[PDB]
Amino acid sequence: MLSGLNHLTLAVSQLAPSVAFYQQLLGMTLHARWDSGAYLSCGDLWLCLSLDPQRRVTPPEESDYTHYAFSISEADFASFAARLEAAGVAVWKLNRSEGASHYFLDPDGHKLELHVGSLAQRLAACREQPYKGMVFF
């Protein structure tokens, strides 16, 4: 059967600024780069950045809610979010509707998130403060 996410591939319009964002600013590990892409890891996540002439720099009001959240500990969350803010990283959401989260954009407008907590923790939180119509299986 399917066993998890093998990799996340993000199309990018300019390879070098995107590598710098994920490696230098977000601290991911860069394993290789080539003329049209790069391979990084973030813990067990395999991230591929793929140079794509079709990728457009997309304002957050023009894209849907599809987004990619990265795990961070409770101890590191606030200072990492504040560092992104001080570095001028654009945002896209302010209301914490799914717990402790910081919502920010990559150079092409990919919607990213820092989040503290697991699915199990979110389900437990939702039992106390459920979303409208929520059912648990």
Ligand X SMILES: C[C@H](O)c1ccc([N+](=O)[O-])cc1
Binding residues for Mn(2+): 7, 67, 113
Which residues does the chain break after (C to N > 2.5 Å)?
A: none
> Which does residue 93 touch among a copy of itself, ligand X, Mn ion, none (CB within 5 to 8 A, set by kind)?
none
Task: Label residue 113 exposed, middle or buried (CB < 10 Å: 0-12, 13-18, 19+).
Answer: middle
Contact of 105 with 113, CB cutoff 8 Å? no
Residues in 21-80 at the binding interface with ligand X, rule: CB under 6 A: 33
* 3-state class (DSSP) for residue 3: coil
User: What gap in Å lies between CA 42 and CA 27, rounded to an integer?
Assistant: 8
Please count the other Cβ atoms lying within 10 Å of the Cβ belonging to residue 48.
14
Answer for which of 2, 5, 87, 135 binds ligand X (CB under 6 A) is: 135
Determine the distance from the C-alpha atom of residue 19 to the mean position of all C-alpha atoms in its chain, rounded to a whole number.
14
**Which one of 7, 9, 14, 16 is in contact with ligand X (CB under 6 A)?**
16
Residues near a copy of itself (CB under 8 A) are: 1-11, 26-28, 30-37, 39, 41-46, 50, 52, 54-56, 63-73, 76, 80, 110, 113-115, 117-119, 122-123, 126, 130-137
- Residue 24 vs 69, nearer CB to Mn ion: 69
Identify the three-state secondary structure at position 120. Answer: helix
- 70-129 residues in contact with Mn ion (CB under 5 A) are 113
* 16 binds, options ligand X, Mn ion, a copy of itself, none, Cβ within 5 to 8 A by partner type: ligand X
User: Does 42 engage in binding with Mn ion (CB under 5 A)?
Assistant: no
Residues lying near Mn ion in the complex (CB under 5 A) are found at: 9, 69, 113
